[PDB]
Structure 1
Amino acid sequence: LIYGNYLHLEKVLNAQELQSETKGNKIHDEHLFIITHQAYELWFKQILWELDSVREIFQNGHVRDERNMLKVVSRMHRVSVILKLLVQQFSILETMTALDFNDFREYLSPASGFQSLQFRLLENKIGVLQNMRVPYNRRHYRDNFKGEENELLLKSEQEKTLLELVEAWLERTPGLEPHGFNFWGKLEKNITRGLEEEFIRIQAEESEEKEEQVAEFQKQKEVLLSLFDEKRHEHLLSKGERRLSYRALQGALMIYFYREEPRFQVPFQLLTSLMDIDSLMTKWRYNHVCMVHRMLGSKSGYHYLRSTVSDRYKVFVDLFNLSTYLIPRHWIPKMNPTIHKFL
């Protein structure tokens, strides 16, 4: 077993054909364009491999055994480390000027990055919903794909996404049981009391400060009490402005507030990594847009791509938005030894 055979370099290093040269007009920088995309695709393959392995752990029930949490978080962390490298990798393609790109751009049609099967599979397997995607040229993204590739993309839409698998796990988070620690019941009561206490403090001296604090209080009150409005949540779900079930949201908040408790330490890291992956995917899209602009100019692909840099494409937006519902520590329902050892 030789290095080159083990790595199948007879394939990897014989996959570089310049279209400019095939048409009798070799342009040096086309080689860079090819390699860059090939490297992205290798790493997309690796991300898919990690992500599919994690989906499997959830889907088959292995995640129920908490011994598997280290591997889950290590692999999700690994995805974010790869995505960071992929963001940095744009720095290489930025050494190609727009003038040099323009010398071989004509030979590219009818190819586009849009046709990256793996990029789509990745979006779908994380949990981008087809109905929420921004249309390209007034049409669905999958119409750009055909045959088995179209079929694979459909499977990736219909099979359970990372979002759905995490959701189901969040729904089982310990502590939500009304008969048990009764997290939600206690949280509602403590926030009500907390707000009442604050109001009383505010009620007494009249000044600019008071005027502001009253307004702030009213806004904070509206936000925090809205958390207990399950109907509003259902409505925002139907519009796609939220993604997690109400119960899963409760699970996530339980993990956030009790993160230090031993059984929640690695789960909290997992939630953190999920947000990280969303943020890095967005950064990838942002860096991609800025580079399309520098190469093709304004006037559109550019405008479509800019539209993808939105909360529409943030699958774990609900994990980000839990910051909105932070409260002072002393309002958090206490978890003393009496009710401590369940975690």
Structure 2
Amino acid sequence: GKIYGEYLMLDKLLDAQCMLSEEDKRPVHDEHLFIITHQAYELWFKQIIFEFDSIRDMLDAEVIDETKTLEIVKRLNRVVLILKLLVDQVPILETMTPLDFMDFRKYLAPASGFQSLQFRLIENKLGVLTEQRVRYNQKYSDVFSDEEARNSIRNSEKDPSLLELVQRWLERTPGLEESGFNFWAKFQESVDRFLEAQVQSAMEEPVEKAKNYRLMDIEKRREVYRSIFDPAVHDALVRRGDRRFSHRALQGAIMITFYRDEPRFSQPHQLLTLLMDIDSLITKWRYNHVIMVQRMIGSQQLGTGGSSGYQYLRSTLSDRYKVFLDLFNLSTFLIPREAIPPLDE
């Protein structure tokens, strides 16, 4: 259409609100808020999926130019803003009293009446690994009984996640080229030179206690650099789940963080930063959600079957559920400006 309500299909949208306590002649005022809050979330979930899918398609290519990079940054930044908004929607629902919630929670399935298809789709499309999930809601068949739902989740798991496609993009970054700039080799070399210089400076320290601390610290630094310079050590950290990136992907990430001030790397950096922001904001939502759940129905209530639901949500707060874990730690491997191999080529 052309008129507001026809274009936005408001006749459909605003007829999707059925208060179950109302049609059962025992009306609870706040049930209206409950419905609207979730529906607002669900609309935004759909937008997030829509942005995610379009970024997946753009990343599923051999060449990502500067122009498409900007478009991705924009869309990731948009998701960040939506996520902040979703974090702030929780205190609106927290405004309903526990006793009011109790008077209509009976109209809801114990665990099925609280699980969102779209949220699970967001997790998978972002890159939450199935094996990283806790035992409780690990298999999606146990969570969702519907058939069309199962097909979507299966598709989300099999299809390339945002985690996978970012890794492939990270592997192709210019500068890791042995033939060209050869950053990894130059990096190792400057780590050796910088650390050597550090040992000599520490040996010249007048106070004995200060010498020992610096020597101990330099040794702890060697162990850090061993975990990135020895591919065997890295692959081990991947297998136990302390890292997620392939070795070459981490190489790309580290290079980006190094030259982030440089016009050629500023946008790739921004992309990574927004990836972290998204991860962190999802965690922030999780935290707010669990505080609200506990505020409403404690750790356990009638019909809840004990405290396993609460304990599950509390365990989703762990780094096991963070998709871009490697990104948070990248400054661990950082050396000062002077020691970084200059960009010339």
Q: Report if TM-score (shorter chain) is over 0.5.
A: yes
Partner of 1:98: 98
| CA distance, structure 1, for counterparts of residue 101 and residue 208 of structure 2 | 63
| CA distance, structure 1, for counterparts of residue 46 and residue 234 of structure 2 | 36
Whether 1:144 aligns to 2:152 is no
Q: Which residues in structure 2 correspond to 1:27-106 (within 5 Å)?
A: 27-61=28-62, 64-106=64-106
| CA distance, structure 2, for counterparts of residue 332 and residue 160 of structure 1 | 34
**Match for 1:306 among 295, 305, 314?**
314
- Judge conservation of contact 1:236–1:242 (CA < 8 Å) in 2: yes
Q: Tell me the CA shift for residue 135 of structure 1.
A: 2.0
Q: Tell me the CA shift for residue 53 of structure 1.
A: 0.6
The alignment yields a C-alpha RMSD, in angstroms, of 1.5
Whether 1:117 aligns to 2:117 is yes
| TM-score normalised per structure 2 | 0.93
166-175 or 17-26, larger mean C-alpha shift? 17-26
Partner of 1:162: 162
Q: What is the aligned residue count?
A: 335
Q: Tell me the CA shift for residue 97 of structure 1.
A: 1.5
Partner of 1:235: 236
| CA distance, structure 1, for counterparts of residue 227 and residue 122 of structure 2 | 34
Gapped runs of 5+ residues in structure 2? 301-307
| CA distance, structure 2, for counterparts of residue 265 and residue 286 of structure 1 | 31
Instruction: Give the letter aligned to residue 13 of structure 1.
Output: L
| Alignment CA distance shift 1:60-1:187 (3 Å) | closer
Instruction: Give the letter aligned to residue 337 of structure 2.
Output: R
Partner of 1:176: 176
| CA distance, structure 2, for counterparts of residue 135 and residue 30 of structure 1 | 32
- Judge conservation of contact 2:127–2:164 (CA < 8 Å) in 1: yes
Gapped runs of 5+ residues in structure 1? none
| CA distance, structure 1, for counterparts of residue 6 and residue 223 of structure 2 | 64
| CA distance, structure 1, for counterparts of residue 29 and residue 280 of structure 2 | 34
**Match for 2:330 among 313, 316, 322?**
322
Q: Tell me the CA shift for residue 102 of structure 1.
A: 1.4
Q: Tell me the CA shift for residue 272 of structure 1.
A: 0.6
Whether 1:108 aligns to 2:116 is no
- Judge conservation of contact 1:19–1:108 (CA < 8 Å) in 2: no
Partner of 1:200: 200
- Judge conservation of contact 1:135–1:141 (CA < 8 Å) in 2: no
| TM-score normalised per structure 1 | 0.94
| Alignment CA distance shift 1:143-1:27 (3 Å) | same
Instruction: Give the letter aligned to residue 332 of structure 2.
Output: T
- Judge conservation of contact 2:171–2:249 (CA < 8 Å) in 1: yes
Q: 1:229-255: CA deviations, max 9, x gaps? A: 101111222223211110011111111
What percentage of residue pairs aligned between the two structures are identical? 59
Q: Tell me the CA shift for residue 91 of structure 1.
A: 1.4
Instruction: Give the letter aligned to residue 330 of structure 2.
Output: L
| CA distance, structure 2, for counterparts of residue 148 and residue 264 of structure 1 | 42
Q: Tell me the CA shift for residue 113 of structure 1.
A: 5.9
Q: 1:72-125: CA deviations, max 9, x gaps? A: 100000000000000011110111111221121122225646531100110000
Partner of 1:286: 287
Q: Tell me the CA shift for residue 2 of structure 1.
A: 1.5
| CA distance, structure 1, for counterparts of residue 112 and residue 333 of structure 2 | 42
